[PDB]
Symmetry: D2
Subunit: 296 residues, 4 copies
């Protein structure tokens, strides 16, 4: 199989069940919404050594579609453990969205995906020290928390789902610059797929990992040396000088599949791409297998 002359390896991404929330942040403008967004979703590439996996879902929510009539952005926050996710919701919304100029936080978990709920707004409202007030806004139960700016509006409760984490594909390129141009094109495409996010910096992984380590016994993960171009005994095709990985989390398997589909399609339009692969664990770890040949 080839897409625009680029080899698609007959392999699969191995992905996992993971708990996820989806939050709508609105603010006085898109600019201020993004300010809160970047802060709240930062230090959140991987649960290997980050507190969560977080990223932007929809970069632009029209003011006419938000509960308060203001510009919005949707983000997603995820973790393998639901209790840690609830902690991460409280911390990131309370430290990064409550503190952000003009930003409000509303639930954006689709009705069908909702399995559980965490009362993040209620838990945050105690910051008001007795002065907090419940109200209804556009049919939503919200807390109005007095802050020095005026008020912080946060929805009482946020829906939690079991989503899919670790959808992925590798871009194998003739050089680093060609690999990165291809990878950014992929991420631009993934931007448009609702319910999916790419937690790594710019959505791109420059340092893909393997489980554990061969030489050490204190490492949870180490470099995927099989795919390292400066490693003597690497398993890279000839003419492959750089590898990038795109890692995708989503509300469901279909959102991850779509993000993988449009990502690869976009990457294969860029020059100097040799082949597309995917990362898996030989079916021994995950709950999902997304086969590349099935997507096209």
């Amino acid at each position: 199989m080839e897409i625009n002359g680029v080899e698609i390896e007959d392999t699969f991404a191995e992905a996992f069940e993971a708990k996820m929330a989806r939050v709508l942040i609105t603010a006085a403008s898109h600019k201020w919404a993004m300010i809160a967004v970047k802060e709240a979703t930062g230090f959140g590439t991987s649960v290997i050594m980050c507190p969560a996996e977080a990223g932007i879902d929809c970069g632009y929510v029209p003011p006419e579609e938000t509960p308060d009539g203001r510009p919005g952005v949707t983000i997603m926050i995820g973790h393998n453990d639901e209790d840690e996710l609830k902690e991460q919701l409280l911390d990131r919304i309370g430290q990064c969205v409550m503190t952000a100029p003009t930003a409000s936080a509303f639930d954006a978990m689709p009705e069908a995906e909702k399995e559980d709920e965490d009362r993040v707004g209620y838990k945050l409202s105690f910051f008001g020290d007795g002065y907090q007030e419940e109200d209804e806004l556009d049919g939503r139960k919200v807390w109005k928390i007095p802050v020095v700016e005026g008020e912080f509006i946060v929805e009482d409760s946020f829906g939690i789902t079991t989503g899919v984490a670790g959808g992925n594909f590798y871009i194998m390129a003739e050089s680093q610059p060609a690999g990165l141009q291809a990878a950014e094109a992929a991420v631009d495409a993934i931007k448009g797929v609702e319910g999916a996010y790419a937690p790594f910096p710019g959505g791109i992984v420059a340092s893909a990992s393997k489980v554990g380590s061969k030489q050490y016994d204190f490492l949870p993960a180490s470099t995927n040396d099989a795919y390292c171009p400066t490693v003597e005994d690497n398993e890279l095709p000839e003419g492959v000088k750089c590898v990038y990985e795109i890692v995708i989390n989503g509300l469901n398997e279909e959102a991850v599949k779509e993000a993988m589909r449009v990502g690869i399609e976009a990457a294969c339009q860029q020059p100097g791409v040799v082949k597309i692969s995917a990362g898996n664990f030989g079916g021994k770890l995950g709950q999902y297998e997304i086969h590349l040949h099935d997507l096209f």
Copy 2:
């Protein structure tokens, strides 16, 4: 005292000793440098419920002044506890800079400020699983860690200092929009002060806090209700409808003082600003007191 007709309150900011590191991130472009920067310094407004306090120091480092000849950006990461700071250095550089396309990480702690060092590069190099290599780059001891992209270059060791955390001033404004325009002008000014950063979203705090809670026994902090415009018994001057706080951390007291100085000066040039105040704890907590009247 008035600056452009704006009242400067005769008070002080009460700030604290805190451990800090300063990192230079370079990348293929300013764009990719900033990608790594935003990820690495996110979820880091306040040690109240964030793992660290982090932010950009110098947004633009010319390529001719970096060890590798590439565009750079300097960031600062801080914490009240040195052991937690060392953990935060490993986590943020390893998860957010090592994974970021093209980015390298070099020490940027000034010689005079260096009190301690953490071998973050050495500790990260084990990710190479035996394939990592030490080298010298522009006089610096660096580790070349094989990654799927090619290599991750990180300096062996990073200097740690005892800096100053919690420098601050309040902008009291006739309205939220006037407060925010004044606050952003202040942050634009603080951008130019080397050795200082503002950890909050866009550098601005919309929800300033007080120690503990009046009504609850489980909260380490709650809203500063004295400065809340919607609270009935607030201590706000008449005509003050919004308050923002700017919180500043720095390598030393002088860097924080300068950031406070240029910030207030910039804020007072914007329309609708009623007065400037500062947050303190009546001298009972901090190691530093920066009096507003002393700055002008």
Copy 3:
């Protein structure tokens, strides 16, 4: 009639027929597309003293919805004179898109709107000095022009329509900061409206004009003094200390009306707005009269 407490004057915007083109710019990334876009649409606020009226229509076209599978952005270029429009298409695509890294230019004028044709890509093809080559791409007739980068891809011909120019509303606020916050929320809303653009800087006019001048016979336009808050005998409501205008052009009257509607609604959600008005010429001149009360 009020929106969130903001008066909506029972008046109308008076708008005009204008010739318009619509161009899809694709590039290796959204970043490089925007680079071409900002260059090609700049120096194009008003035909009073700029060569054209130009701006971004759709900020994000997904890769899978473009002819070449690459990230896209749509722009619009307008002028009262069709011959001048054709010259502007040639100049802006030839000098600002052809020269921009990786950028291609395709027709994005809807079939139902097309009235005339301008063979821009045919005209630009001669730059190839004999080496240019016609081809077909996703059903479109394109020219592949050899350039030092590789090739410039440009559609043979672009459609021209009689659109609408000069749709508008005024935001009257309690202060400059309040007015600008409301105005940017409006522009955020207008972003989402396909086939409409706001040609002024950030979509906002800080210096609205009237036809001619009371004092100077060499001027085609001068300040709208009745709405200047510093002018002594102004016709501004008390409490209004700042006025902004949002000027909108579009493919048809419906796009203009829609941009006006969502822009006003978004503006009215922001604090410190007193009323909304609109600029007309007494209904004695324009082809279109858009009554504010008819929008809601």
Copy 4:
């Protein structure tokens, strides 16, 4: 001569005398200054088919270094004809800066460079229709023009110099992605050089031209086929699959030389660059000849 393994051709850039102005734009924030700047400097890559050659000089002027204590950005506008330059100053400031929210325009031409004066602010003052008012601001003679926002502040007069236009170098790389990564690093470097600007989109020319035409007697200029990688009979080194040009204008020859020097050095640190060249016209046309070997 090699820089980082990259050949530096023993050739020269041939550049020309050109008339130039330099403008300081201040605004409520860096964001709004940038809004005005992009509008005012757009449609200004080349005087071949654009009305002027314009670009950002300094991206960040600190508030305390500006006449009004507000965030600033400096831009430059050039043209071979002084009368056309004066018209371009009037058109670009009057239509793109006067109209931009909160933006002011001050002279930023160093005294040592000043040759001529253009009373732009005086010429713009008539827009005030009698209500305009001269004042002094930070020792500068300015006009306060009443506008719907409040006031437009513009310096009475702007200095004009005979600068340098057409400084250049070519980046010859192994691929388009490699070329563009090198070219952007170059532009990042050129950003830091005061008194020099790169007028093309993102600073980069994707379609360098040659004088005249081989096939068409009616063309003044066409694609430099000698440097087109898709042209069969090109004069490109083997292994070169992409060429970019960086074009630089500046206040004097030293600024141009400096931008060339740091731009080349930055480019050469990026992977996949084969050689650096420069464009000239046989030493017959230009006033300046800038030899690449003389820079390092």
